[PDB]
Amino acid sequence: MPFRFSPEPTLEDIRRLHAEFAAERDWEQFHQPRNLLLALVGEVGELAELFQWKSDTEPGPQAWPPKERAALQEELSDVLIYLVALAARCHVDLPQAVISKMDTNRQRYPVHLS
Amino acid sequence: MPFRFSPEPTLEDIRRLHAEFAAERDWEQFHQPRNLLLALVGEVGELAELFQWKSDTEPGPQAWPPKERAALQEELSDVLIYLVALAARCHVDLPQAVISKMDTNRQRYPVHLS
Amino acid sequence: MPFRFSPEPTLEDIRRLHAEFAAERDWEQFHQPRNLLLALVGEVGELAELFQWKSDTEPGPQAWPPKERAALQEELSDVLIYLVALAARCHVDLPQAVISKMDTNRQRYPVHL
Amino acid sequence: MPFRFSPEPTLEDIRRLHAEFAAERDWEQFHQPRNLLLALVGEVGELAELFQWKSDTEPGPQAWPPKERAALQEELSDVLIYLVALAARCHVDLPQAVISKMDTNRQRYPVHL
Ligand SMILES: Nc1ccn([C@H]2C[C@H](O)[C@@H](COP(=O)(O)O)O2)c(=O)n1
Numbered sequence A, B: 001m002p003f004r005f006s007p008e009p010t011l012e013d014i015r016r017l018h019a020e021f022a023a024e025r026d027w028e029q030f031h032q033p034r035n036l037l038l039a040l041v042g043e044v045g046e047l048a049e050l051f052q053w054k055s056d057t058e059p060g061p062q063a064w065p066p067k068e069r070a071a072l073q074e075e076l077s078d079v080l081i082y083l084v085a086l087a088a089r090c091h092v093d094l095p096q097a098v099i100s101k102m103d104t105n106r107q108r109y110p111v112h113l114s
Numbered sequence C, D: 001m002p003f004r005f006s007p008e009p010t011l012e013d014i015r016r017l018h019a020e021f022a023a024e025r026d027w028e029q030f031h032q033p034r035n036l037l038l039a040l041v042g043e044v045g046e047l048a049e050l051f052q053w054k055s056d057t058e059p060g061p062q063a064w065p066p067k068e069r070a071a072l073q074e075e076l077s078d079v080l081i082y083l084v085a086l087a088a089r090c091h092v093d094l095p096q097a098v099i100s101k102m103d104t105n106r107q108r109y110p111v112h113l
């Protein structure tokens, strides 16, 4: 059956949620751009660890066991949360940046040359 | 003045945009989970390169020159695009995964213990 | 007091040690190039975690506390071990590759500029 | 024909070579621990880029074409050079740390299990 994401939360919603979470704990001081970037790298590491010993032939993530699916959800989420936090801290409008990048991607790879 | 993201595109919008982009070029074959993960790692590398030689004291990303701001927008976007693609390819509902992770984050770090 | 690395183990020594370690456990099957690369990325993550919340002003790694020095030693080592394993699995002569790269680095960055 | 690394350069040799390279260009200022770490992450990205679109079935890195072998040598080397630089900047004796980690690895993964 066709797979889709839920319509919410949006990236703005996530930005706002993370900002409130950090503000309640007085963590703004820890959230400088290079801290957030290094935290992002750490979470990408954790995500990679889930895949590192998977063979070419064994079942893919759609079929992993419950505890492994849970970990996968969690690490994908941790990466997104820091990416949002980082983008916001740099005053980058991430949704609109993605539109611009996708337009650039189309120009670099025209369908008739691929 | 207060900074916010635009309300669109949503993560579902980005998922759909990337899927159409890949489908037009017959790239589904290249987009297996471990390919997407390695591409994500590559983009995180490019993002890190923008920050690597910045000193502690010099101005932050909010004040970088136009070409550096453009690169920053682009690499943040490339990371998000592959993260979305990866989540979708694993049938993870990324927005709802983030809600669950944020709830877990609150439980691990109660405000009165921090 | 001048800082230096110890003269051993060499990269070849590390290669041989890791290969024997893996061979004793019948782990050759797990050590394909893309597995090793992803494991390397994981260990780079662990290394980054040690630095992620450090401020500009607090003490630097030369002065970290004992437990943090120990963790730093361990994660730097984990990165090196997988890098060696990956290079060896690809039949790349890593020490000689480094010489070649350093030569190229000199050319790209002339001293007078 | 057995695969081995060359016996030189050693990690100490690489340390000394990189330190002189940086010192000649007055780059000590750029080489703070977190700069070196981020540069390392960048080079791990470049390494990953070489592998990212490879299929399961096409030839593996032992059999890659000449230009791809050259790139692989270079990116493996870039990762090693920054790892050495970072370890040295933190006054970590990387060869001896690796021995300690390998010992710990043996304990965590006993051969009989
Ligand atoms: N200083 C911190 C600590 C945690 N988190 C949030 C974001 C991640 O989703 C998660 C990571 O938590 P941990 O590093 O405890 O696993 O918690 C945060 O934003 N800032």
Ligand SMILES: Nc1ccn([C@H]2C[C@H](O)[C@@H](COP(=O)(O)O)O2)c(=O)n1
Binding pocket: A101, A105, A108, B022, B027, B030, B077, B078, B081, B082
């Ligand atoms: N096989 C590919 C090649 C490119 N891209 C898209 C996603 C990134 O935003 C950007 C990366 O392009 P490049 O690797 O050419 O810089 O293009 C993709 O989804 N799949």
Ligand SMILES: Nc1ccn([C@H]2C[C@H](O)[C@@H](COP(=O)(O)O)O2)c(=O)n1
Binding pocket: C022, C027, C030, C077, C078, C081, C082, D101, D105, D108
């Ligand atoms: N399949 C494995 C598991 C572990 N290790 C070694 C290399 C690292 O130095 C350390 C990583 O162990 P862990 O992932 O248990 O921390 O042990 C290895 O070579 N291959």
Ligand SMILES: Nc1ccn([C@H]2C[C@H](O)[C@@H](COP(=O)(O)O)O2)c(=O)n1
Binding pocket: C101, C105, C108, D022, D027, D030, D077, D078, D081, D082
């Ligand atoms: N500030 C710098 C710039 C370059 N390099 C060296 C280490 C790497 O092997 C290579 C990276 O160069 P580039 O980033 O120009 O590819 O050159 C370095 O040690 N310090």
Ligand SMILES: [Mg+2]
Binding pocket: A043, A046, A074, A075, A078
């Ligand atoms: Mg995590």
Ligand SMILES: [Mg+2]
Binding pocket: B043, B046, B074, B075, B078
């Ligand atoms: Mg990019």
Ligand SMILES: [Mg+2]
Binding pocket: C043, C046, C074, C075, C078
């Ligand atoms: Mg480790």
Ligand SMILES: [Mg+2]
Binding pocket: D043, D046, D074, D075, D078
């Ligand atoms: Mg490089």
